Amino acid sequence: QKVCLICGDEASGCHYGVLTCEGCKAFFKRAVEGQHNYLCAGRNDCIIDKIRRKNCPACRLRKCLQAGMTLG
Amino acid sequence: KVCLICGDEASGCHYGVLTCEGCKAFFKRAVEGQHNYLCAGRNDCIIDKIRRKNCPACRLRKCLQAGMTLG
DNA sequence: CCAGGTCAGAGTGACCTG
DNA sequence: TCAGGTCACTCTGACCTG
Ligand SMILES: [Zn+2]
Ligand SMILES: [Zn+2]
Ligand SMILES: [Zn+2]
Ligand SMILES: [Zn+2]
């Protein structure tokens, strides 16, 4: 049973360099290529799991970057 | 003049409190429908116009602390 | 003025293809 | 293998109706 390194949910394989779920795969794609302005409502250390990963795109993207995800 | 929940421009007194259209609609949906709202922070998230969508749990909390109710 | 109703848009992710 | 495409779904709030 493989686990997403960002939200801890079931992973479907390695995406963009890192073992991730379908959600975090598609999110990282949109986040990097889009012109988004994410701002954490907390302290830039939010819990990112299956239920709360929608809550803070800022911390979700930060975890993607710190885990080493790259489009190429 | 200003929403007591997110600080945005308020449109009037809703459900007991001076709120914007967003926080009005949000509160009704939060108390009637079934929601699994859950804070990813420390239950003290900043609720302003830019970030009010980020944490429904804290947004609902501030609505209740302000005294909003449907009846 | 306020409660209740509504729908189009943004964000999401399950599913498919090669 | 994994990158790219897609679309029905949830949440939201500016706008409408009574
Ligand atoms: Zn994930
Ligand atoms: Zn955060
Ligand atoms: Zn508000
Ligand atoms: Zn919160």
Q: Which long-range contacts (CB under 8 A, 24 or more apart) does A9-13 make?
A: A9/A49, A9/A50
Q: Which residue has the tokens 């801890």?
A: A8
What secondary structure letter does DSSP report for A61?
Answer: H
Q: How was this model experimentally determined? A: X-ray
Name B27's Cβ contacts closer than 8 Å, sequence gap at least 6. B14, B15, B19, B60, B63, B68
Which residue, among B9, B5, B43, has the nearest Cα to B26 in the 3D structure?
A: B5
A1 CA vs D4 C1’ separation (Å): 25
Burial of residue B11, with CB atoms counted within 10 A of its CB: 0-12 exposed, 13-18 middle, 19 or more buried: middle
Q: Provide the strand spans (E) within A1-72.
A: 13-15, 18-20
Rounded Cα gap, residues A49 and B12, in angstroms: 37
A31 CA, D6 C1': Å apart: 18
- 8-state DSSP, A24: H
Token look-up 């709360």 returns A52
Distances (CA, A) of A53 to A11, A59, B13, B49: 14, 9, 33, 20
Report the CATH fold assignment for B1-71: Erythroid Transcription Factor GATA-1; Chain A (3.30.50)
Bridge partner residues of B70 (DSSP):
none
d(CA A55, CA B59): 12
Torsion, Cα A17 B39 B68 B66, to 10 degrees, reads -110
- Min Cα separation B5/chain A (Å): 14
CB distance B60 to B27 below 8 Å: yes
Q: Which residues of B15-52 are buried (b: 16+ CB within 10 A; e: fewer)?
A: bebbbbebbbebbeebeeeeeeeebbbeeebbbeeebb
Question: What is the stated resolution of the deposited model, in angstroms?
Answer: 2.3
Which CATH number, 3.30.50.10, 3.30.460.80, 2.40.50.140, 2.40.30.270, labels domain A1-72?
3.30.50.10
* 8 Å CB contact between B5 and B63: yes
Q: How far apart are CA B6 and CA B25, in angstroms?
A: 13
Q: Do B54 and A55 touch (CB under 8 A)?
A: yes
- Considering all nucleic acid strands, name the nucleotide whose C1' atom is nearest to the C-alpha of residue A17: D2
Residue B34's SS3 state is coil
Residue with tokens 């609720």: B47
